[PDB]
Amino acid sequence: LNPSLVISLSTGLSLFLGRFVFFNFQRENVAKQGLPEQNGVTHFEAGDTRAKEYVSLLKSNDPVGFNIVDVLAWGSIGHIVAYYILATSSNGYDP
Amino acid sequence: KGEWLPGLASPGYLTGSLPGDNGFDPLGLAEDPENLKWFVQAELVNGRWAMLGVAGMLLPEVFTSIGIINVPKWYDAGKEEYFASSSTLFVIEFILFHYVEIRRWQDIKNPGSVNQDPIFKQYSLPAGEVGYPGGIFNPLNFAPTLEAKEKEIANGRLAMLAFLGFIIQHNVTGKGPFDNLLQHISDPWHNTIVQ
Amino acid sequence: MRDLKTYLSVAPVASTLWFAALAGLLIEINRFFPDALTF
Amino acid sequence: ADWMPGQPRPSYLDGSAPGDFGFDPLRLGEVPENLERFKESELIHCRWAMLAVPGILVPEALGLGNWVKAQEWAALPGGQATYLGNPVPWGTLPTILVIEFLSIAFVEHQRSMEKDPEKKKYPGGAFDPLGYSKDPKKFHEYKIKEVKNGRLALLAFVGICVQQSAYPGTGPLENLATHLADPWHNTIGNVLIPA
Amino acid sequence: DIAGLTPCKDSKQFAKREKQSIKKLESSLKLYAPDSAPALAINATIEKTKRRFDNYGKQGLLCGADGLPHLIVSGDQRHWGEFITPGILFLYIAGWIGWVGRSYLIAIRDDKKPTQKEIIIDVPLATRLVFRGFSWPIAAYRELLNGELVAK
Numbered sequence: 001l002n003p004s005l006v007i008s009l010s011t012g013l014s015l016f017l018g019r020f021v022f023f024n025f026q027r028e029n030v031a032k033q034g035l036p037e038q039n040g041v042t043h044f045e046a047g048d049t050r051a052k053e054y055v056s057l058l059k060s061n062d063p064v065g066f067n068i069v070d071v072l073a074w075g076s077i078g079h080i081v082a083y084y085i086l087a088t089s090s091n092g093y094d095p
Numbered sequence: 096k097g098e099w100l101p102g103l104a105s106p107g108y109l110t111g112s113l114p115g116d117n118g119f120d121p122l123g124l125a126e127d128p129e130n131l132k133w134f135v136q137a138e139l140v141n142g143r144w145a146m147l148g149v150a151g152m153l154l155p156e157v158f159t160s161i162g163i164i165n166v167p168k169w170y171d172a173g174k175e176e177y178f179a180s181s182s183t184l185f186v187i188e189f190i191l192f193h194y195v196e197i198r199r200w201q202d203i204k205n206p207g208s209v210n211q212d213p214i215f216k217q218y219s220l221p222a223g224e225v226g227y228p229g230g231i232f233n234p235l236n237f238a239p240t241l242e243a244k245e246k247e248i249a250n251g252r253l254a255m256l257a258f259l260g261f262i263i264q265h266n267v268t269g270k271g272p273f274d275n276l277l278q279h280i281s282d283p284w285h286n287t288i289v290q
Numbered sequence: 291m292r293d294l295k296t297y298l299s300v301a302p303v304a305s306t307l308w309f310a311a312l313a314g315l316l317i318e319i320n321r322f323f324p325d326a327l328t329f
Numbered sequence: 330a331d332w333m334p335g336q337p338r339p340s341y342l343d344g345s346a347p348g349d350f351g352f353d354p355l356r357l358g359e360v361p362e363n364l365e366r367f368k369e370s371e372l373i374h375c376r377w378a379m380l381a382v383p384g385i386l387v388p389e390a391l392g393l394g395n396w397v398k399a400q401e402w403a404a405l406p407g408g409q410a411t412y413l414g415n416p417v418p419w420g421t422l423p424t425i426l427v428i429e430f431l432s433i434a435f436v437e438h439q440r441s442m443e444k445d446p447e448k449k450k451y452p453g454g455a456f457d458p459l460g461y462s463k464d465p466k467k468f469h470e471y472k473i474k475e476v477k478n479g480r481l482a483l484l485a486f487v488g489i490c491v492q493q494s495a496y497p498g499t500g501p502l503e504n505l506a507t508h509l510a511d512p513w514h515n516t517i518g519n520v521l522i523p524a
Numbered sequence: 525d526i527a528g529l530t531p532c533k534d535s536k537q538f539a540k541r542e543k544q545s546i547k548k549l550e551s552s553l554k555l556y557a558p559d560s561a562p563a564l565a566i567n568a569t570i571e572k573t574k575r576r577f578d579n580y581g582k583q584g585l586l587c588g589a590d591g592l593p594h595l596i597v598s599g600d601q602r603h604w605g606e607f608i609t610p611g612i613l614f615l616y617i618a619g620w621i622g623w624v625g626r627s628y629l630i631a632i633r634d635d636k637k638p639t640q641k642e643i644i645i646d647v648p649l650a651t652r653l654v655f656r657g658f659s660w661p662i663a664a665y666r667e668l669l670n671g672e673l674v675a676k
């Protein structure tokens with residue numbers, strides 16, 4: 001198994017899934033349960049200045065709004081699935 | 096109606112309406128009317144099975160002793176070999192009773208609700224009393240009179256007692272019920288609970 | 291006599307008679323069928 | 330209630346839904362929004378078992394492989410899937426495993442995005458090319474025929490699974506073969522009653 | 525066998541224990557004249573010891589390495605006499621006591637001064653309720669089915 005091929009195919013599919021097939025659902029759910037609140041008010045709104053959502057990072061000119069956080073999130077799942085497949089094939093386990 | 100104990104006040108829920116009322120409920124099992132309703136059916140069905148079983152236990156032994164047939168003793172007949180495995184028999188006995196008894200059940204819960212054929216939906220039992228389905232279960236059209244019901248219940252109570260005897264007598268004497276009787280007739284004053 | 295029968299029914303008196311009868315019963319079952327561990 | 334004559338049906342089951350024979354003894358569908366989800370979930374279960382039961386029986390009647398033997402070519406390192414005898418030129422384990430996930434997950438997630446409740450269970454359009462759902466009266470007739478065949482298929486799948494559990498390695502058709510050897514000895518009686 | 529045990533009827537340490545026990549009593553037995561009351565009494569203990577050990581062996585009791593019977597309460601059908609069976613008997617009697625006890629508190633609960641029949645037993649009333657216990661499973665199940673057993 002070619003590691004680069006396995007890793008980049010896994011990340012490719014995971015990134016593809018997060019952009020074209022699962023994007024609406026993930027966005028819908030984040031809007032549904034939005035920012036964490038303490039007593040009816042977001043951590044930032046309560047004074048946690050260090051809890052400010054980084055709108056600068058969240059900005060993207062991608063058509064659907066796929067941003068840098070989505071790449072990190074779906075790209076992480078790909079690398080995890082890839083290294084599961086690689087390590088699992090590296091052994092000679094017999095069930 | 097009758098008195099199982101002359102001069103003893105019958106329970107007040109035993110009012111002379113049920114066939115077989117002799118005032119006998121000294122432990123008060125049946126004071127709640129819904130217990131009474133269920134125990135009536137339970138007495139009918141235990142008494143009807145006892146009558147079939149006691150006849151099936153005693154009478155074949157009598158006819159072997161005479162020599163017109165030769166069949167196993169009732170406590171041996173399970174051992175015998177039959178055209179089908181005994182576990183096969185049990186599964187079909189379970190499935191057939193399961194259907195037939197749930198149907199008897201529905202009629203206790205909801206009288207009349209299960210008198211009609213579910214497949215050939217043109218056939219039906221006529222309306223009647225729970226525990227007495229009639230119609231095709233009474234093909235000779237006997238009148239289900241009070242006297243007949245009282246004889247049915249007396250015979251059922253006697254067979255239930257007799258079955259109790261067959262069971263205890265066998266685990267004490269090893270032999271069979273007609274054997275215990277013949278042995279007792281021999282010299283009665285010495286074989287009577289000396290075991 | 292009816293006063294005596296009332297006293298004989300008072301909690302302690304009815305208890306000793308009840309438990310005495312109980313103890314006698316359990317003792318005699320144990321004299322007739324001793325050392326029962328099974329059943 | 331049709332499923333058990335004489336038994337009162339739940340008040341939220343009036344017989345209008347396809348396959349509403351009044352069966353819900355645990356009252357699972359008392360929460361209306363769960364009832365509707367359960368209607369959708371039942372059809373999905375029905376249509377999968379209706380595809381699987383042919384898939385379990387047809388290849389066993391034909392070339393080697395009961396539904397369990399058809400799966401033992403994977404697991405152990407090697408991979409040589411054979412469809413109709415010819416080893417398919419892609420029947421290695423990781424190849425179809427990814428194809429199955431990608432294809433099934435895509436079409437299953439697409440199913441979940443339908444907001445309309447009647448299209449969640451009866452979508453139509455492309456999946457009704459022959460226009461069988463055009464006639465409203467005929468539409469509901471096929472709705473009942475679907476759920477009844479589907480519940481029968483689910484029931485058969487349980488038998489297949491439970492039979493496999495009792496006679497491991499064997500196939501359901503070999504079970505029928507073994508049954509027809511002597512039906513009065515090769516039954517579920519052996520399973521229910523050991524030896 | 526079950527739990528690595530062996531039947532007390534085959535157990536060597538079980539047999540040793542009976543032997544050491546009889547030898548203990550015989551050391552006392554030899555102090556007394558054979559007609560004497562102590563000799564008869566010690567001999568009575570000895571026979572009872574012998575009856576007990578044969579009885580445990582014949583009932584199917586399993587023994588451990590210690591030579592003592594160990595009870596199997598798991599449900600196994602060869603050992604229902606060690607828990608299931610005396611347990612059903614306990615629950616039957618315990619429910620009888622409690623059902624009779626509740627019958628009496630209910631019978632007197634609407635009386636004028638109810639605590640008077642709680643410190644002075646109305647024995648006539650009690651002799652009439654004492655046999656309600658025979659059927660407590662049916663009576664208690666019946667009061668349940670028609671709202672009489674628990675209050676709301």
Ligand code: CLA
Nearest residue numbers: 621622623624625626627628629645646649650651653654
């Ligand atoms: C009618 C009698 C009776 C009845 C039916 C119950 C029933 C109950 N009790 Mg109670 N209890 C009683 C008397 C009774 N109790 C007495 C007299 C006391 C004082 C010692 C207690 C102290 C007690 C405690 C501390 C606890 C219970 C608990 C319970 C529950 C669980 C079972 C239990 O732990 O038993 C336990 C039983 C006892 C500790 C002792 C009672 C046993 C006596 C001997 C029975 C009554 C005899 C009475 C004199 C009969 C006379 C009738 C005659 C005139 C005809 C259950 C509701 C438990 C509970 O709440 O769980 C939810 C709990 O924590 N009870």
Ligand SMILES: CC(/C=C/C=C(C)/C=C/[C@@]12O[C@]1(C)C[C@@H](O)CC2(C)C)=C\C=C\C=C(C)\C=C\C=C(C)\C=C\[C@@]12O[C@]1(C)C[C@@H](O)CC2(C)C
Nearest residue numbers: 120121122123141144145148151152169172255256258259
């Ligand atoms: C079911 C019936 C027996 C049916 C047995 C049949 C099928 C046997 C069939 C077979 O034999 C064959 C044909 C062939 C054999 O080879 C095998 C078997 C399989 C064996 C017995 C019921 C037996 C029924 C028993 C005896 C019922 C007795 C209960 C009475 C005494 C209750 C008395 C009181 O309850 C009151 C009424 C009210 C309270 O106030 C007071 C008290 C005192 C509590």
Ligand SMILES: CC(/C=C/C=C(C)/C=C/[C@@]12O[C@]1(C)C[C@@H](O)CC2(C)C)=C\C=C\C=C(C)\C=C\C=C(C)\C=C\[C@@]12O[C@]1(C)C[C@@H](O)CC2(C)C
Nearest residue numbers: 353354355356357374377378381384385396397399483486
């Ligand atoms: C039966 C089961 C559902 C049973 C649930 C019913 C009883 C619940 C009844 C009740 O809830 C009600 C209604 C109401 C409540 O008041 C009471 C209860 C009693 C609670 C679903 C099984 C559902 C089973 C279906 C989903 C399985 C589909 C399997 C397919 C994919 C298999 C494909 C393959 O078999 C091939 C074709 C070839 C092989 O070689 C390879 C593989 C892959 C194995």
Ligand SMILES: CC1=C[C@H](O)CC(C)(C)[C@H]1/C=C/C(C)=C/C=C/C(C)=C/C=C/C=C(C)/C=C/C=C(C)/C=C/C1=C(C)C[C@H](O)CC1(C)C
Nearest residue numbers: 146147150232233234235236250253254257260272275276
């Ligand atoms: C419904 C129908 C309808 C149509 O229409 C018409 C018709 C046909 C008429 C009908 C039918 C009916 C029939 C089925 C009947 C049956 C009955 C019988 C079974 C009885 C038995 C009956 C039964 C009987 C009583 C029983 C009895 C028994 C006896 C006591 C016993 C005694 C004994 C003892 C213990 C022991 C010893 O050691 C011995 C002896 C001495 C021997």
Ligand SMILES: CC1=C(/C=C/C(C)=C/C=C/C(C)=C/C=C/C=C(C)/C=C/C=C(C)/C=C/C2=C(C)CCCC2(C)C)C(C)(C)CCC1
Nearest residue numbers: 011012015071072073074075076077079080081082083084
């Ligand atoms: C713009 C654009 C584009 C481009 C883009 C791209 C090309 C992308 C890429 C991307 C990528 C390519 C990404 C990546 C990501 C990654 C990540 C994010 C990772 C992660 C990782 C991790 C998390 C890991 C972990 C671990 C470790 C460390 C160890 C071992 C184990 C594990 C695996 C767990 C396109 C053309 C399409 C279109 C148009 C526009």
